[PDB]
Amino acid sequence: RQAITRAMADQARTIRIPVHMVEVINKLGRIQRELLQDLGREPTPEELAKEMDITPEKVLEIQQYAREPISLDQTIGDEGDSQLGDFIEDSEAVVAVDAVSFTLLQDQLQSVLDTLSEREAGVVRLRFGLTDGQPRTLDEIGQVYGVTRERIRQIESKTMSKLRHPSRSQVLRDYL
Amino acid sequence: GAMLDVNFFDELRIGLATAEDIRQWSYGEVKKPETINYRTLKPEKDGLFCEKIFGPTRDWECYCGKYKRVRFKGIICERCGVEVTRAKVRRERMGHIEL
Amino acid sequence: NSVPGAPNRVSFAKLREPLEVPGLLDVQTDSFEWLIGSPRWRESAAERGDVNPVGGLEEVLYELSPIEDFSGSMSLSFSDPRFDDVKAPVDECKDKDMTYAAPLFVTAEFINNNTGEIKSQTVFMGDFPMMTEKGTFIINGTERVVVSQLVRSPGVYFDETIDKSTDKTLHSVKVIPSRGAWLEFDVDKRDTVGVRIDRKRRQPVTVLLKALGWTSEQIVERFGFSEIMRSTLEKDNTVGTDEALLDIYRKLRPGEPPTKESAQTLLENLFFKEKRYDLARVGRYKVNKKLGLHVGEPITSSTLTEEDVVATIEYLVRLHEGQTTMTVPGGVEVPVETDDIDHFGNRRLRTVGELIQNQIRVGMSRMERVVRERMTTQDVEAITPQTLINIRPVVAAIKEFFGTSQLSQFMDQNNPLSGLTHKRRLSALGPGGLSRERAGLEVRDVHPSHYGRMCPIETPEGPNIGLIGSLSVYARVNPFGFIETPYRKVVDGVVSDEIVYLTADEEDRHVVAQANSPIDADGRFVEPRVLVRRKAGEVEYVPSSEVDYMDVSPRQMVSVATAMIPFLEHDDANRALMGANMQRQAVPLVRSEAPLVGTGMELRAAIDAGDVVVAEESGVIEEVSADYITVMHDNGTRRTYRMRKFARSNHGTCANQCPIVDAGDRVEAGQVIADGPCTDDGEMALGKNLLVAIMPWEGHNYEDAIILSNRLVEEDVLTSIHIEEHEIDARDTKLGAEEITRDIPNISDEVLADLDERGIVRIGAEVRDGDILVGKVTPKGETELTPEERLLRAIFGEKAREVRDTSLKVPHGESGKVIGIRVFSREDEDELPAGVNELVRVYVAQKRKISDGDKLAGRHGNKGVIGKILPVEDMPFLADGTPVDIILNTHGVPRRMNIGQILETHLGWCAHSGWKVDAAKGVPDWAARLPDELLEAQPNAIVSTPVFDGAQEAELQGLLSCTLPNRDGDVLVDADGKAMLFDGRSGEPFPYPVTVGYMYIMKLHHLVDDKIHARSTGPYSMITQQPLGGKAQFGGQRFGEMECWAMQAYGAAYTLQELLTIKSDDTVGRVKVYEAIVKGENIPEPGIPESFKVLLKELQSLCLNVEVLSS
Amino acid sequence: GSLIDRAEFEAENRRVVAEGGEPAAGRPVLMGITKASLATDSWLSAASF
Amino acid sequence: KRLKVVAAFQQSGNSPMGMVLDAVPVIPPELRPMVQLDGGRFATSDLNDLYRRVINRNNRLKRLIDLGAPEIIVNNEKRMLQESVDALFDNGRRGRPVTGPGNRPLKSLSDLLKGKQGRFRQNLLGKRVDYSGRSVIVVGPQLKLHQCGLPKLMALELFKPFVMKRLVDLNHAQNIKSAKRMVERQRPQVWDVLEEV
Amino acid sequence: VQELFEARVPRGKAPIADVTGRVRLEDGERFYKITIVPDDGGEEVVYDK
Amino acid sequence: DRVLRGSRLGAVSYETDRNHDLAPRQIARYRTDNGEEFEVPFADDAEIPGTWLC
Ligand SMILES: C/C(=C\[C@H](C)CCCCC(=O)O)[C@@H]1O[C@@H]2C=C[C@@H]1OC(=O)\C=C/C=C\C=C\[C@H]1O[C@@H]3C[C@H]1O[C@@H](/C=C/C[C@H]1O[C@H](C[C@H](O)[C@H]1C)[C@@H](O)[C@@H](O)/C=C/CC/C=C/C2)[C@@H]3C
Ligand SMILES: [Zn+2]
């Protein structure tokens, strides 16, 4: 009986649950069912938490963990010709208008950054990591520019004060 | 013949595949009847969804997060074991069972 | 007549009827009251079969008890089912989504045998759903209807076939029970009667006979005359009872070693021990009536017997002998003939009571196995019936029967006629019934035993034709499940008024006269030769001495909704079918005016559908408003009836109930007190009365198109209210808990004006497609940002706003006001499902006008969408200035054989203008058989032609000749029924007179706003990458196989490459197509489809090496 | 007993009248449309049918 | 009838040893996904149960062989593994089909191809397309023969990227994002652009 | 039409002649018999059922 | 009582797919018992484990 119960608790569910949580799930189900038979009313979560001497939020966590998944090959409609898996929207796909909007945003940002000088645009692109993935820090840009980091930081502050102008913001405001 | 499918084909040969072909297609041997960790919802190790066998779930990310961008691509994390690449190779890599 | 608040609707009916229409929900209500065991059913059964008052639960609990162990040392029994009061009333259940139910209680008794102890406990069996006042169930707040099912009854069904090689008749028999095994006694190409038992063919009859213990002497004695039986008794090649038993055991068992106690018990377990073979009381009555075994004995011992088996073999061999009648020793004689499987004496009706009893029995079996399991493993002198019984399989069986089973349907209600005909519906298919591929051509036919038991007209017209029909008007269900029909008995040519309800077999035994036969007003027939219906459905004339039964009325053979068609006897059958189907899909308008010309079946079919507030007890009105009426009874008491102002029906239509009594009137018990959705002064009203001309007008009314005036859009003649709901739920998640709030990130203050403080909208805000209803925000989690996003947030200074916005936006192409916000919560202690925190429902309501594209129809199957709404002045008017309203088409009338619309148009014009038959010198010759007070009528008067006895054509001519003028001296319509219209557009009169009149058309539920759809780029599928489907999602149309064949047959190949690569599956192709269109470049060359790649991976996973080769 | 095309079989008679001459004897047969479409040259159009 | 398959194995460069199977392959997981819904509810893909049964019985057979068991248990375990792989490849072929919850037979690998619901007759030959529409029809007797009517509320959704490019080109919007929002709000100039496109 | 394109043997299968010549008609018991005499040295073709 | 909107358990980013430079990497050659060879490209600064699951 030990081998049968342990092996059923291991290989019963499609998502594997350890045996102590399966034990408390079985205890919760038997407790709720017996209190329904002896009561005539299906009890409350606080009643079950009173009976099992645990907290009601733990009772809700257990009753959320106890739910087994559904299968994607069932008949959704009236007649059976439609699987469930044909009506699930793939949200991780490409929305295909925001991608081309991202491309146009990159080109617009290129135009706006190229309306300034060379040192400013280079420091900004190295600071925020546009030509490469990793953003260079102030010490890295001071190394690549032959200066200290304080001049780099003053250049950064002055350029960020420059870029908040409406002449450089009226085209980029609608991109957020 | 072709394997990257450049839409330049002239034949499509079917054939009865041997065990030497089966264990040549596969990337890793699945050896546990688990799918997903019940608590953190991550793919289990050596399961039917294992990220070492079938590839990573996140774009250019290993399992332990030690390599997390495109500059580490085409390498394998020496701790976790997931080859860091795009996450769309979970649609194309196969595994096998040794009976 | 005989309804206290009836409008005076004068009838053209020539002949009196004896029997009024029975209560139309009597099948549902009386079957459920049979199941419960209600005292009303108790006194009715005491009137009609008083020998055994047995309910459904009592029958199941008595076929269950007793329940013992294997040792027989302890027994558990059941007794006394008994209900309680319901836990909540109907409207509260529909509000808070609770199911309308009541608890079951059962007195259980556990008996120990050796020492002897009985233990009486009151076991709570479960929550049992209860039927409402109108025959509907309520499940989870929705409203459901259980449909009846037609199955073939148990018994013996003798039938013959030809063999088409030797061309000899090969008879057979199928002793088919309820819940048992089968057995067939065929006749082969030879004369060896094959006894294929449980579909294991061999072994002629001597095997079963000597297996029963019969010797060759007794086989010779009972079966001596039969050449077939003596040939088999010589070709038996087996002597000995045990010699037969070992053959039976080795062929039926095989895979088990035989022994002389197993074959001793196997046959006695299969067909006689009643734990495995219980043909029901229906089957016992059917077999005992078919062979004539017992006559007056009550129905008990529901298993078979060896007497019945040898009677079956004797009947079969005398049927192959070609005899006429047979008397088995021990019983009365019976005729010898083959049986049919489509006769209505063999198809019983499994109604709702038997349907719920079956699921309760299949729950009680699984409870019984658990109880008899734990009656051993539990220790003795320690058990109690509270510990024995597990009610979980019974409550799960009830729950799985009501929710998600194809005979427990979601009740449709777009009008009370469709509610009423959604009940009283017979379906031949379902669980335990044949599917549509097993449905042969023979079962869809109309057998001649359908006269008055099932309507031949009303049925669906898709692939389900003939499998679903409705009951007739006067039909009534037997106690056993057959369908009874009334008949007036005539004695010696004197038609009496006693009424005898007759099923199909007794309808075959006698001869039955016609409904509209000329009675001589004494009971005597006028002519000696009367039409009649013979046994097999033959139609003959007959001398009137032989006729012993007469129909109760015409329209007996027809359904409810088909009896509401005027002039049915002039139409065809297919267009009448389309009219009876399209009559129930009408929508409720805002005004709902009663029809001018109708039949007598509107008042009864409206007050019997339950959607009209009817005064329970008489008295006087105290107080009226738009919500509540309080009558004052004769003795002190008062009673408030609450209305339903704008409730949402089950399909998105309005459910108004306005009152129709003033504050001083006196109502009697049964008077209609408030209209319903589609009613006017009590009776049904599905549309409006519209002036119509039958000319073809400039190709706009071409090929079943209908044009209308602008007066219907202006004066709101055709206008329905539609109410939809939207539902969202704030629940917990892994990262936190979603909240309903005003602070939605990355949103302006423009869309946040209509929202109030707790996030939901106000009441009365007119919304458009894409506006915020419920402002809900989710915890987003941790994501990395693109550098452009990072420096843009640095440029504008705006923060991260780490929670993701997912509101409830009103979907595409919807608008209207916001009626009501019913918001539940967890903190206010409502019954919410596990893991949910806050549920909220918002009800949006729009007021749809009429529009071109909407589907209109008359009452004779003359459908057609609206072609063009003309303005008022370019619409052909009469010689009075009155414009016509709609213009039908001429060419659709004569080729469809439905001139009932032309007769209804003529009689409608007569009823609108009003007439006066000038009997100055005597009543004229056409109107000599008209009733009185039909010689003259006021304008806008109502009339009523019944179905098969109505206005004659000569009487229509005579009414249409004398048709008193409008306001001037002006008879606008001559004796032909036509008028001289003027062209409203050019100006000249039309050169020929044109038929006009007042028709009655209804607006169907096929509006355009539920059909028009488009898609540029929406969602996509999961496994494959195709776009999704249907208007519920965004979805795209299906470019199937035959359209690909057409595109190949054109020679157009590039469009096929387009539609099959870069619009459905080219995952890197779609975004390049979009970018190329936006930037203005050429479309790139496509690539391979992902569905083909999926095909390749599945073929590689089926151990098939598939290598794609370059060269 | 194997059904082969009239073009492929007659070309194989051309290859076999040389290099030692004997003809494979054949008589023309008439087959229905399900039987004809399944024995095509492509295993993709046949399996899709 | 025998020479057909024997010459089929003899002519090509094939071996008959591949009819038995020493290593089963696994389909990639994105063709049998475990997608979670909104609200934590999960959805398997009905091949995971067959794969899990094969994995379970294979591990148990390996443990029985390494443990050392009598012939009855090992023979029954090997026939169990054989039945599981046969049910994986074609459920309902030999004997009773393997049913899941609710007495529904599971969708095996061959059932992704067979019949009308397979890949061939459902998703390879006829697919759902984009840039599409559907509505009811009426008679238009003033049109010429090559013309057709069209509702503007439907043609505005059919021709959305064309009209987006065109009203970006005419300076009615700053970029594609405000142009798309302008189409969604249906401002009174988008019809004047819609006629041109 | 479906039995033509599928090339089944038909229901009302009427035999045809196989050679020129005169016939030997027989009206048998419940089913006839027809035999065709050839104009050459061949056996007379019999059609029984 | 909601809309069927699924999502696989994983995120999809999009960065610059450039192959002109990568991180420098070694290649370790692992060997099983049955005469098999395998190549696993680890990074340069990576403690290469003495065993490996092939
Ligand atoms: C095909 C079928 C039912 C169809 C869905 C509806 C009727 C088809 C005939 C027609 O085309 O008009 C069979 O129905 C049952 C057995 C199995 C079959 O169900 C089936 O196999 C198909 C579905 C079985 C249970 C479905 C439950 C849920 O499916 C939705 C919600 C739940 O119930 C359904 C409600 C259907 C009510 C219909 O009612 C009809 C009109 C509309 O088609 C519907 C409003 C009315 O004409 C009404 O008079 C007809 C009722 C059908 C009579 C009983 C038949 C037995 C709704 C479609
Ligand atoms: Zn790692």
Question: Ligand 1 atom 31: the closest Cα is on which residue?
Answer: C410
D38, containing H or E segment: helix D33-38
**What is the residue whose two structure tokens read 């469009």?**
C1055
Cβ–ligand 1 contact at C898 (below 6 Å): no
Question: Ligand 1 atom 22: the closest Cα is on which residue?
Answer: A78
Torsion of CA C226, C229, C235, C237, to 10 degrees: -140
Q: Which residues pair with A96 in a beta bridge?
A: none
Torsion of CA C565, C570, C571, C577, to 10 degrees: 40
For B23-81, the DSSP string reads HHH-SSB------B-TTT-PBPTTSTT-HHHH--SSTT--SSSS--STTS-S-B-TTT-
What's the gap in Å between C403 CA and the centre of ligand 1?
14
DSSP one-letter code for C519: B
Cβ–ligand 1 contact at C431 (below 6 Å): no
Ligand in closest contact with the CA of B75: 2
DSSP one-letter code for C587: P
Nearest to C279 by CA among C302, C307, C305: C302
- Report the amino acid identity of residue C797: G
Whole-angstrom Cα Rg for chain F: 14
- Residues in B touching C1111 (Cβ below 8 Å): 1, 10-11
Closest atom, ligand 1, to C-alpha of C584: 47
For C216-276, the DSSP string reads HHHHHHHS-S-HHHHHHHHS----SHHHHHHHHHHHHS-SS---TTHHHHHHHHHTTSTTS
**Interface contact G2, partner C, CB < 8 A:** yes
**What is the residue whose two structure tokens read 């038996």?**
C236
Cβ–ligand 1 contact at C422 (below 6 Å): yes
Distance CA E135, CA C468 (A): 30
Cβ(C946)–Cβ(C555) below 8 Å: yes
Q: Which two tokens stand for residue C899?
A: 């001139």
Q: Which residue of F has its CA nearest to D32?
A: F6
Q: Which residue of A has its CA nearest to G2?
A: A88
- What value, to the nearest 5°, has the Cα angle with vertex E19 and ends E16 and D4? 65
Q: Which of C144, C404, C406, C587 to mutate to test the pocket of ligand 1 (most atoms within 8 A of CB)?
A: C406
Cβ–ligand 1 contact at C405 (below 6 Å): no
Question: Ligand 1 atom 51: the closest Cα is on which residue?
Answer: C422
Cβ of B16 within 8 Å of Cβ of E59? The answer is no
User: For residue C472, what are the CA distances in angstroms to C21, C451, C455, C475?
Assistant: 11, 9, 6, 6
CA-based torsion, C424, C429, C430, C431: positive or negative: positive
Neighbours of C323 (CB within 10 A): 13
Provide CB contacts within 8 A for C375, sequence distance 6+.
Answer: C69, C74, C76, C383, C388
Those chains having 3 or more beta-carbon pairs within 8 angstroms of chain C are A, B, E, G
Cβ(C632)–Cβ(C621) below 8 Å: yes
Distance CA E23, CA E19 (A): 12
What's the burial of C364, exposed, middle or buried (CB within 10 Å: 0-12/13-18/19+)? Answer: buried
Residue spans of beta strands (DSSP E) within C681-785: 683-684, 688-693, 705-708, 720-731, 739-740, 772-774, 776-779
Ligand in closest contact with the CA of B63: 2
Q: Which two tokens stand for residue C256?
A: 């088990």
Q: Which residue of B has its CA nearest to A61?
A: B39
Distance CA C798, CA C1099 (A): 52
User: For residue C983, what are the CA distances in angstroms to C109, C706, C765, C970?
Assistant: 88, 18, 46, 20
Of A87, A99, A133, Cβ closest to residue G4: A87
Q: Resolution of this entry in Å?
A: 3.4
Cβ of D47 within 8 Å of Cβ of E120? The answer is yes
Ligand in closest contact with the CA of B58: 2
Nearest to C609 by CA among C782, C470, C420, C778: C420
D6, containing H or E segment: helix D6-17
Has B64 been labeled as part of a binding site? Answer: yes
CA distance C652 to chain G (A): 17
What's the gap in Å between B79 CA and the centre of ligand 2?
5
User: For residue C347, what are the CA distances in angstroms to C431, C435, C556, E150?
Assistant: 16, 17, 20, 53
Cβ of A16 within 8 Å of Cβ of B38? The answer is yes
Method used to solve the structure: cryo-EM
- Report the amino acid identity of residue A58: K
Q: Which two tokens stand for residue C604?
A: 């009864």
Residues making up chain E, counted from first to last: 197
| β G5-6/A89-90 pair status | parallel
User: For residue C448, what are the CA distances in angstroms to C348, C425, C506, C536, C537?
Assistant: 16, 19, 14, 8, 6
Provide CB contacts within 8 A for C619, sequence distance 6+.
Answer: C631, C632, C633, C634, C666, C667
Cβ of E23 within 8 Å of Cβ of B48? The answer is no
CA distance C1019 to chain A (A): 6
Distance CA B1, CA B4 (A): 10
Of E35, E38, E39, Cβ closest to residue G8: E35
Distance CA C148, CA C408 (A): 10
- What value, to the nearest 5°, has the Cα angle with vertex A76 and ends A75 and A82? 65
Cβ(C151)–Cβ(C282) below 8 Å: no
Q: If contacts are CB pairs under 8 Å, which of residues 989-1008 in chain C contact chain G?
A: none
Cβ(E181)–Cβ(E160) below 8 Å: no
DSSP one-letter code for E112: G
Q: Which two tokens stand for residue C456?
A: 């031949």
Those chains having 3 or more beta-carbon pairs within 8 angstroms of chain E are A, B, C, D, G
Cβ of G11 within 8 Å of Cβ of C729? The answer is no
- Residues in A touching B34 (Cβ below 8 Å): 16
Question: Ligand 1 atom 55: the closest Cα is on which residue?
Answer: C427
DSSP one-letter code for A23: H
Cβ–ligand 1 contact at C423 (below 6 Å): no
Distance CA C734, CA C62 (A): 52
Ligand in closest contact with the CA of C467: 1
Cβ(C930)–Cβ(C942) below 8 Å: no
Q: Which two tokens stand for residue C960?
A: 């249409």
Backbone angles phi, psi at E89, to 5 degrees: -75, -40
In this structure, which long-range contacts are made by residues C1097-1102, counting pairs with CB atoms below 8 Å and at least 24 apart in sequence? C1097/B92, C1097/B94, C1097/E27, C1097/E28, C1097/E31, C1098/E27, C1098/E31, C1098/E109, C1098/E112, C1098/E113, C1098/E119, C1099/B14, C1100/B17, C1100/B25, C1100/B94, C1100/E25, C1101/B94, C1101/E25, C1101/E26, C1101/E27, C1101/E109, C1102/E89, C1102/E109, C1102/E110
Of E18, E36, E85, Cβ closest to residue B16: E18
Distance CA C139, CA C93 (A): 9
Chains F and D touch (3+ CB pairs under 8 A): yes
Closest atom, ligand 1, to C-alpha of C464: 9
What's the gap in Å between B82 CA and the centre of ligand 2?
6
- C:G CB pairs within 8 Å: 8
Closest atom, ligand 1, to C-alpha of C412: 45
For C48-80, the DSSP string reads TTTT----HHHHHHHHH--EE-SSSSEEEEEEE
What's the burial of C17, exposed, middle or buried (CB within 10 Å: 0-12/13-18/19+)? Answer: middle
Cβ of B41 within 8 Å of Cβ of C1104? The answer is no
End-to-end Cα spacing for chain D: 24
Cβ–ligand 1 contact at C350 (below 6 Å): no
- What value, to the nearest 5°, has the Cα angle with vertex E185 and ends E184 and E188? 115
Q: Which residues pair with C707 in a beta bridge?
A: C887
Distance CA C779, CA C805 (A): 8
Distance CA A13, CA A19 (A): 11
Q: Which residue of D has its CA nearest to E124?
A: D48
Q: Which residues of C391-414 are buried (b: 16+ CB within 10 A; e: fewer)?
A: bbbbbebbbebbeeeebbeebbbb
Cβ(C1036)–Cβ(E130) below 8 Å: yes
Question: Ligand 1 atom 29: the closest Cα is on which residue?
Answer: A78
Q: Which residue of A has its CA nearest to E56?
A: A11
Closest atom, ligand 1, to C-alpha of C422: 49
Distance CA C106, CA C898 (A): 60
Provide CB contacts within 8 A for C897, sequence distance 6+.
Answer: C571, C572, C575
Cβ of G5 within 8 Å of Cβ of E36? The answer is no
Ligand in closest contact with the CA of C461: 1
Q: Which range of residues forms the domain containing residue C199?
A: 155-335
What's the gap in Å between B42 CA and the centre of ligand 2?
13
Task: Say which CATH number the domain at C263 has.
Answer: 3.90.1110.10
End-to-end Cα spacing for chain A: 63
Cβ of G6 within 8 Å of Cβ of A89? The answer is yes
Q: Which residues of B touch G (CB under 8 A)?
A: 36, 41-43, 57-60, 67, 69-76, 78, 81, 87
What's the gap in Å between C783 CA and the centre of ligand 2?
19
What's the burial of C325, exposed, middle or buried (CB within 10 Å: 0-12/13-18/19+)? Answer: exposed
Provide CB contacts within 8 A for C205, sequence distance 6+.
Answer: C185, C193, C195, C229, C232, C313
CA distance E36 to chain C (A): 12
User: For residue C500, what are the CA distances in angstroms to C476, C868, C1107, E159?
Assistant: 12, 56, 79, 71
